[PDB]
């Protein structure tokens, strides 16, 4: 909704900044141990609650 | 004929969401949110059903920005009591005081 509280908007701001894929140089660091961001969420298939 | 929409978040035909159709210089018919109609004061007697005369019929907080002359008349109880009952209040006050002198 357009009507948001500051806590909800601050909560959605954090989840919006975590929905970024891993940097490419991370796979060169850990030896391809972390291949992808397993915590990527889509706005349709998984909701926040 | 063009179909116009609301200009605010409120989407229900409540008493605060009242509009009127206004034609703009851009030849557009837009909604213009109206103020609720005010009421002129009633007489403090509680008998006369009509409202007082010589007083603006505006909202309560609009009376704060109006001058004092626009909120009463130049009579004794003007602005709170009607002229008809003020005459009755004067004659009732006089005649009762005269009956209290007869008993003395």
């Amino acid at each position: 909704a357009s009507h948001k509280t500051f806590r909800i908007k601050r909560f959605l701001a954090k989840k919006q900044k975590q929905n970024r894929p891993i940097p490419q140089w991370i796979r060169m660091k850990t030896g391809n141990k972390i291949r992808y961001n397993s915590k990527r969420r889509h706005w349709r298939r998984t909701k926040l609650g | 004929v063009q179909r116009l929409t609301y200009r605010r978040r409120l989407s229900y035909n409540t008493a605060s969401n009242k509009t009127r159709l206004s034609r703009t210089p851009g030849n557009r018919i837009v909604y213009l949110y109206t103020k609720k109609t005010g009421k002129s004061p009633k007489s403090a007697c509680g008998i006369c059903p009509g409202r007082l005369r010589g007083i603006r019929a505006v909202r309560p907080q609009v009376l704060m920005r109006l001058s004092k002359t626009k909120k009463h008349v130049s009579r004794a109880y003007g602005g709170s009591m009607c002229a008809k009952c003020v005459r009755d209040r004067i004659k009732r006050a006089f005649l009762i005081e005269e009956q209290k002198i007869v008993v003395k």
């Binding site: 806590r7 909800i8 909560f11 609650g49 | -």
Partner: protein, 86 residues
């Protein structure tokens, strides 16, 4: 009816994020969290759920100040003094 057509009428939050435990169990009309008991002064922690106790006991968070006591204890809670300079 009782099934699919009833799930469409769900657009009113019953619980929100609690200010004490951060969980989405703060009942709005009751004004009481369902997970930590906020705003009651004492946290609800029942012994009939070892897993629930395991998820929010001491040691499951940061322990910003309790981990420092562990380091200060092994030195006798030394205060006021400083190491001998070079």
């Amino acid at each position: 009816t009782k099934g699919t057509s009833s799930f469409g009428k769900r657009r009113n939050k019953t619980h929100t994020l609690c200010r004490r435990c951060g969980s989405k169990a703060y009942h709005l009309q009751k004004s009481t969290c369902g997970k930590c008991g906020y705003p009651a002064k004492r946290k609800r922690k029942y012994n009939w759920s070892a897993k629930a106790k395991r998820r929010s006991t001491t040691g499951t968070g940061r322990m910003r100040h309790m981990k420092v006591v562990f380091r200060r204890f092994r030195n006798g809670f030394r205060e006021g003094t400083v190491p001998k300079p070079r």
